[PDB]
């Protein structure tokens, strides 16, 4: 007698359901990994014994998406080709834990300025049963959690 | 000046400024006379800074409210209470910030609402005033004392101020003044003697021989000038000549232990009445009282001889008091006591 | 106004204010609204938010020396935790018609348990208390927040267990409102954020600068053996409530927490047993029944708020022919069932007895 | 106008247009201080004066309204750059389906934007709380009779710097 | 006396004393006890705490050059 109704309010959310609207666009991904929150830590110590610890400047996050090859065209590659030796269309990332239809969003991972940094090929081999997967490496340089 | 046009402007009225440099544990009730002609006829009434202070009093006065908050927020000072003598057993009890009652040129009214909020528990600190008069030196020493309480809570501070606008500063003022630059650089623990309060001087020199008849028993706690660490008070002592209960540092020291720990388990009242709930109170305590004992404030080089807090269900209550709600705990911690005598003793021999 | 499919920008709004969700502090407050559409003046209608107070009722409602405070009264109901918040527009005091009529309109509705009329007007209050009273002792579930006018009970109820007093007027940036708007809010707050078991006595009230009494120890000492439940002003903290007493001066029934998590459990196993109405009155239906009431006790035990250690030492169901009924009793239609808890107290007095021996 | 260009490039469209210097022209009479005086309230002349160094600004900052809200050209041109901005960003969200998925898209455009606004130093606030807030919801912003005429309602709210205009020197000869 | 639903502070208390479990060692003291309330003069009462000590038994018993040597 838990009324799944009570379940929306009351159970963790799972991982396996996620859009990623990729600037202006949503993109679907497999994966996506290292939106995290990291700050660095200051310390000082005087010969009385007072320890005094504080948080530093946080630092930039590394965001890893991965999606499969499809015989389309490749969004990810006209992105990190168009670069000119400090210029890129830098866009805003957000992944949205998601309801089963999509009509719902539940939490999601806001990321501010997004470029490309890598874009590594899927490793061809004749003895797999595998799809060809490309995975981006993204820069950015702060993360936030909207929870609605 | 009345502001027009976008400039910058220039004006050169008499004005003045004091920075505040505020000590939380420092918080006085400033009584009045009810028989005073100049004050606003509000009995309560609330001053931040000088800024504020100047804006109902607007004139340098002479009186003894004046010259004693004047003298308060020269040497920082934070926010204060203007309470008239019929009144202050009332704002002790209603505005819960309140940890010293400086009685500002006042006595008699002020001693029999001291001794009200003493025994009803209200944690507070008494400075009380000397005789504005002369005492002789023949002054047979128990009959100056008389006036006063024999509470561990107050203390007398004699010698009145001559303030160098002319006016005179209640003693309770500049003893008021040095509490609060030592609660700020030293802390509660240490005691207000050896601080040095500026722009006043004592009305009245006074020897060493003096001052050892009056140091036993009810301490006058004499305001002295000295040439090196210029015009300080100069005695620690309470009104009671007690092995636990002497020494303003030490009881100072626990008011603001007890007021510190009820700040904090107030959040935690409500709460069950359970063995969970005594583990957070009693962990709520030795994280507070550790804290405090390794900024030099408690006695005792190890946290066993320093603090020690103990709760259970058949050690401090009993299973009749928890149905009552009630919720027993025992701390028992040391206080360093200050050095009062130097004895130098010279010789000619190697 | 919309007819472009651009975007419009307006620049002189009032921020919204958020709602909570909630389902045992549903309050009907009794108070002077004022309807735009003249069709709910007499009925009880249901206000799921800020945004559907706007709407039905008038929110502005220029003053001319009296004010209009049943507006602010609901502004700070949803800043200190909101609810469906039902309302009944009663315009002036006297009208015996509307109030008389008044218990039979709570029954209709299926939801409502706290009653908590905000009006600061005091012979307004006491003919809301006294026609309210009789309902109080009808086993509904119900809990009246009363307010105190000098330091004691209004005298329309007395010393029943469902009703709380809380005493000093608090003032809004100064008009002065009776509490129980507010405390119909903290309410909603701490049953969901901690349980009905819970006291909600810490809960620092938002919105609010001070009240109009600085109430000290001495006058709460004489205040406190009756359920008075004084809004307290800390320094370091603000305004908190402060006191989770009842009217009751029984053991059992003394303290808020108790009282409504009886409440609470009584309401939820009697929305558990109604589709179990008009079955077959056999031995197979009486083991239904106790297994639906056997298992809501244990999942209340699991999340705190009985108080035991084995599970039978914090409550018990009983059915059976030889137990709780008679042959006699089954065919008349009814069947009996003796269900038992055991609450927790909260711990209200600390002593902390120092020393400096060791 | 030309205050504006350059006090726009280097210095926001939050700063005052005022001590910037334009060149190449000065002004054809001269105005005192007390002048400006009268014309300082109300419906606020913002002169154009003259000053060894800061050589031919203009003098003055106000708007045509003197309100605690919208005097101060500042605080104005602050908004309708953020309006301006906002709706730039917003139109490419315009016939969207109108879901709760789009309203968390539209308030985190909008949180995007302020917060890189609030970090180079437009917004009044040493934290977020104080300096922004956007909201939208079902029963927050709008109702579902407005849901199903095609409506999307945001409350954004935001602080602005206002600036120091006056500068009052007190002198005396005692220490 | 408490009333106040605050928090309450006394300063000079004795410190409490912990009492271990054991099942081979309970003794019986006979000696000079003085209760408080007269109905256990004659019989045998588990004290199972020093806490129980103070409530049923006069845990102070002033001196006069004999001096009372059960409590201590």
Same mark, same amino acid.
């Given at each position: 007698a838990i009324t799944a109704d009570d379940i929306a309010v009351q159970y963790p959310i799972p991982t396996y359901r996620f859009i990623v609207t990729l600037g202006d666009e949503q993109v679907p991904f497999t994966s996506a990994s290292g939106l995290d929150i990291n700050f660095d830590t200051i310390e000082y110590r005087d010969g009385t014994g007072n320890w005094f610890k504080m948080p530093g400047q946080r630092q930039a996050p590394n965001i890893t998406l991965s999606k499969g090859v499809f015989p389309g065209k490749n969004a990810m590659y006209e992105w990190i080709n168009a670069i000119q030796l400090n210029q890129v269309e830098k866009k805003d /990332?957000?992944?949205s834990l998601t309801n089963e239809a999509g009509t719902e969003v539940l939490v999601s991972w806001n990321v501010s300025n997004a470029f490309p940094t890598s874009l590594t090929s899927p490793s061809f081999d004749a003895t797999s049963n595998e799809i060809?997967? #490309? #995975? /981006?490496t993204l820069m950015a340089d702060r993360v936030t959690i909207q929870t609605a | 000046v009345t502001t027009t046009y976008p400039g910058v402007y220039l004006s050169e009225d008499a004005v003045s400024s004091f920075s505040v440099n505020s000590a939380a544990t420092a918080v006085? +009730?400033?009584?009045?006379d009810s028989e005073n002609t100049n004050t606003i006829n509000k009995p309560i009434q609330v001053f931040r800074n000088w800024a504020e202070f100047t804006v109902e009093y607007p004139t340098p006065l002479e009186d003894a409210f004046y010259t004693s908050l004047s003298l308060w927020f020269m040497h920082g000072g934070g926010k204060c209470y203007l309470v008239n003598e019929a009144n202050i057993a009332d704002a002790v009890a209603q505005y819960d910030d309140i940890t010293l009652i400086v009685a500002a040129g006042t006595d008699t009214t002020t001693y029999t609402a001291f001794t009200t909020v003493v025994g009803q528990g209200y944690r507070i600190f008494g400075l009380f005033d000397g005789p504005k008069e002369k005492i002789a030196g023949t002054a047979k020493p128990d009959e100056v004392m008389e006036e006063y309480p024999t509470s561990p809570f107050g203390a007398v501070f004699y010698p009145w101020g001559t303030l160098a606008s002319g006016a005179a500063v209640p003693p309770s003022a500049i003893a008021a003044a040095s509490i609060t630059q030592t609660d700020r650089t030293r802390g509660v623990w240490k005691a207000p003697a050896n601080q040095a309060v500026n722009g006043v001087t004592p009305a009245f020199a006074v020897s060493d021989d003096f001052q050892g008849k009056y140091n036993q028993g009810k301490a006058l706690n004499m305001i002295r000038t000295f040439s090196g660490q210029g015009?300080?008070?100069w005695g620690a002592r309470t009104l009671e000549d007690s092995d636990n209960w002497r020494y303003i540092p030490? $009881? $100072? +020291?626990?008011?603001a232990v007890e007021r510190d720990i009820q700040k904090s388990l107030n959040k935690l009242v409500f709460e069950p009445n359970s063995q969970?709930?005594?583990?957070?109170?009693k962990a709520a305590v030795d994280s507070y009282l550790h804290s405090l004992w390794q900024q030099g404030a408690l006695a005792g080089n190890t946290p066993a001889d320093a603090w020690f807090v103990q709760v259970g269900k058949d050690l401090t209550m009993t299973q009749e008091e928890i149905n009552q709600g009630k919720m027993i705990i025992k701390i028992g911690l040391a206080a360093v006591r200050p050095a009062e005598f130097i004895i130098l003793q010279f010789s000619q021999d190697i | 106004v919309t007819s472009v499919p651009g975007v419009y920008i307006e620049e002189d709004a009032s921020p919204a204010m958020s709602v909570s969700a909630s389902a045992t502090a549903v309050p009907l407050f009794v108070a002077r609204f004022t309807p735009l559409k003249p069709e709910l003046a007499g009925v009880i209608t249901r206000i799921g938010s800020w945004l559907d107070y706007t709407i039905l009722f008038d929110s502005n409602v220029p003053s001319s020396v009296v004010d209009p405070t =049943?507006?602010? =009264?609901?502004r700070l109901y949803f800043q200190n935790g909101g609810g469906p918040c039902y309302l009944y527009p009663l315009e002036k005091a006297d009208d015996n018609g509307p109030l008389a009529a008044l218990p039979d309109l709570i029954d209709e509705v299926g939801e409502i348990t706290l009653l908590a009329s905000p009006d600061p007007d005091e012979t307004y209050r006491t003919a809301v208390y006294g026609a309210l009273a009789a309902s109080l002792d009808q086993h509904k579930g119900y809990f009246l927040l009363a307010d105190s006018v000098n330091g004691d009970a209004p005298s329309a109820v007395g010393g029943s267990a469902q009703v709380a007093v809380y005493y000093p007027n608090v003032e809004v940036p100064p008009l002065s409102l009776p509490p129980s708007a507010l405390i119909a809010g903290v309410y909603g707050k701490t049953d969901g954020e901690r349980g009905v078991w819970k006291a909600p006595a810490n809960v620092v009230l938002n919105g609010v600068s001070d009240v109009s009494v600085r109430v000290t120890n001495e006058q709460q000492a004489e205040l406190n053996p009756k359920g008075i439940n004084v809004?307290?002003?800390?320094?370091?903290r603000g305004l908190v409530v402060w006191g989770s007493r009842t009217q009751k001066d029984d053991d059992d029934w003394r303290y808020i927490p108790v009282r409504r998590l009886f409440d609470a459990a009584e309401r939820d196993i009697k929305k558990a047993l109604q589709p179990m109405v008009f079955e077959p009155n056999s031995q197979l239906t009486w083991k239904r029944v106790q297994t639906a009431i056997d298992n809501y006790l244990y999942r209340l035990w699991q999340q705190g708020a009985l108080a035991g250690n084995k599970a039978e030492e914090a409550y018990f169901v009983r059915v059976g022919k030889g137990i709780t009924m008679t042959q006699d009793e089954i065919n008349q239609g009814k069947m009996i069932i003796q269900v038992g808890m055991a609450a927790v107290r909260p711990a209200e007095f600390i002593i902390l007895k120092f020393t400096q021996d060791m």
């Open positions: /990332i957000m992944i060809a997967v #490309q #995975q /981006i | 006085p +009730l400033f009584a009045y015009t300080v008070v030490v $009881r $100072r +020291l626990f008011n969970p709930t005594w583990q957070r109170v | =049943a507006s602010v =009264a609901l809004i307290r002003h800390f320094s370091d």
